[PDB]
Structure formats: C-alpha cells, structure tokens
Amino acid sequence: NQALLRILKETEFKKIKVLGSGAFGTVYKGLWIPEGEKVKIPVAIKELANKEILDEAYVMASVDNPHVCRLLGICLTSTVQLIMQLMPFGCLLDYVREHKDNIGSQYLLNWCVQIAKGMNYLEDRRLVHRDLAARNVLVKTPQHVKITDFGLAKLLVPIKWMALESILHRIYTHQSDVWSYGVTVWELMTFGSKPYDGIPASEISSILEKGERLPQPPICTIDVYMIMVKCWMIDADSRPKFRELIIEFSKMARDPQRYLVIQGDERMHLPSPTDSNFYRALMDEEDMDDVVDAD
C-alpha cells in the first residue's frame, strides 16, 4: 500500500538539531510544516536508483506493530531522507547507561518481551532486520519500547552483534536476528556495557569458534543467562524462536525477582495506574498489549 508512505518535498520540513550520528546516516530532531498551515510539528529525520530505494521504503512504511517503528515519509533529492515519529526518550542503549543500576527487573524483563514481540512480527512477515542492537531500540515511554532502523541494513559492520554464519558468510536469517537479540538482551542486563570490549573485531569469529561467549551479567540468574547462551549456539536451528522468547520472558516477568537480582528492586516497580494513564494520554495513545505484571 503506497498510501502508507508520504512523499515530502524538502520545502515542508527542516532539520533543526542532530540527535545522533551512525554509519548509515545522521538522525535529526526536525519540524514538519504542513502546507498552508502555520504549525511546526516535531518529527525525526534521518539523512543517509530511486526505484530500488522506494521499493524498500514502501516495505518499511508497511510495518505496523506496537514494537517496531514505522517509516512515515521520505524525501529524495541528492540525498535520501527518512521521516518517522520523534521519540524524546531516545535510544534504549543511552537510557540504560544513564539509568544504570536504577532500573527495576520488571522493566528489563518486559523490554525483553516487547523486543521479541516486535521481532516475531517481522519474522511472520518474512522480514529480517540484520541490525538489532540496543542502539536500535527506542524508548516511547519507560513502559513501551520499539525497534527502529528496520530496512536500512538491506537498503545501504556490526561484527560484535552478528551470528557466526553472518560473520563468515554474510548469511542473514531470522535465526541470525535471534543471535543479535541475545546480544541486545546482554546489553540491557549489563546496562549498556560494550560487548567483547577490548577485543578486535578481527578475532571475534575465532573467539566464537573456540566456544567463548559474552559473560553472565551480574544481575542475571542462570536461567536468564541460559537463554542468552542458547541464542548464540553455532547451529542456527538450535537457537530459540522469537515466539518462544516472548513466552519465556513473559513467564519470568510474572515472578521477576526469581530471575533477576537487582539491589533496591522492591522500590523499582512498574508505574501506578495513575502514572501509567498520564504517560499514555500524553505521549503513547497507540494500541499495545498490556505489560506483564508480577503475580
């Protein structure tokens, strides 16, 4: 459906401020000015054959799930610029670093559920993300996270997030996405530690072949670490399925203290109904499955 992608002229938007720079391009806070109107509407803009580009943009614009960000519009000039909904809380990687040791188990486990729900939706569509990482998950509210940057990897190298077969053979599948999910979970549980820090990307493949993996995060029980380890099995078909991961983390979220050990966790519960309602009226009106609370 081409009605899902708005083609914008550069005259009706302007980049105002940089939010982050990558290898794919630069992300700006921006403003949309509807033609014939006076209002400035805050948006996010990412500046990176047109037919090949538009073909993929239409796919990205078709993504409709509470946990994957949808491409809303595009402007093609000398540059390709993408427009999506601005999310003030930013990327989850920054969020966990800036809130280190101050995040409750209920939030961490529920984020794992939500990311796996978003990836399952892509898998059902037979779509592969290719670049899942904490830097590519955004916070809509503390209770609601969303995968972003879908489509860009294919459209345009994260060795330390990649499945061995991706490193060696540039094979990308749903099951290589599961490997990167495991690394993403590791990032969250360590509050944004760098994976294999101090180790050259050039030797990651040899480290993995020797059976070495990312270490157990200090807050993870053995059951949680075992899920991560299963995500990094050499045999792709022996790794978990996103559908299974949804179920597993949803179970842990029902008894969160049994699965993560976090100091002061008893005062880091999910927000009250009052506060959850305020957050939603104010910045999260889209429909979404209820978060999993403790039994």
Q: Is 53 exposed, middle or buried (0-12, 13-18, 19+ CB in 10 A)?
A: middle
d(CA 256, CA 90): 25
d(CA 255, CA 293): 8
Longest pairwise C-alpha distance within the chain? 63
Contact 51, 71 (CB under 8 A): no
Question: How far separated are the first and last CA of the chain, in Å rounded?
Answer: 42
Single-letter code of the amino acid located at 281 = A
Between CA 131 and CA 253, with CA 106 as vertex, the angle to 5 degrees is: 85
- In sequence order, which residues have a C-beta less than 8 Å from that of residue 85 and are 6 or more positions away? 43, 44, 69, 70, 72
Helices (H) and strands (E) counted in the chain, each on its own, are 10, 8
d(CA 165, CA 171): 6
d(CA 217, CA 131): 22
* Pairing of β 137-141 and β 6-7: unpaired
Give, in order, the Cα–Cα distances in Å from 171 to each of 161, 232, 276: 14, 15, 41
d(CA 72, CA 206): 41
Contact 48, 24 (CB under 8 A): yes
Q: By what method was this entry solved?
A: X-ray
Give, in order, the Cα–Cα distances in Å from 196 to each of 5, 89, 187, 223: 39, 27, 11, 22
Here the tokens at position 188 are 């969250």
**Quick check: do 1-86 and 87-281 share a fold?**
no
Query: How distant is the alpha carbon of residue 268 from its chain centre?
Result: 23
Q: Which residues are catalytic?
A: 131
Here the tokens at position 67 are 């946990």
Contact 79, 25 (CB under 8 A): no
Among the CATH numbers 3.10.310.10, 3.30.200.20, 3.30.1950.10, 3.40.190.10, which is that of 1-86?
3.30.200.20
Fold of the domain built from segment(s) 87-281: Transferase(Phosphotransferase); domain 1 (1.10.510)
d(CA 104, CA 227): 20
Question: Which one, of 146, 47, 111, 134, lies nearest residue 249 by Cα?
Answer: 111
Could you tell me the residue ranges of all domains in the chain? 1-86, 87-281
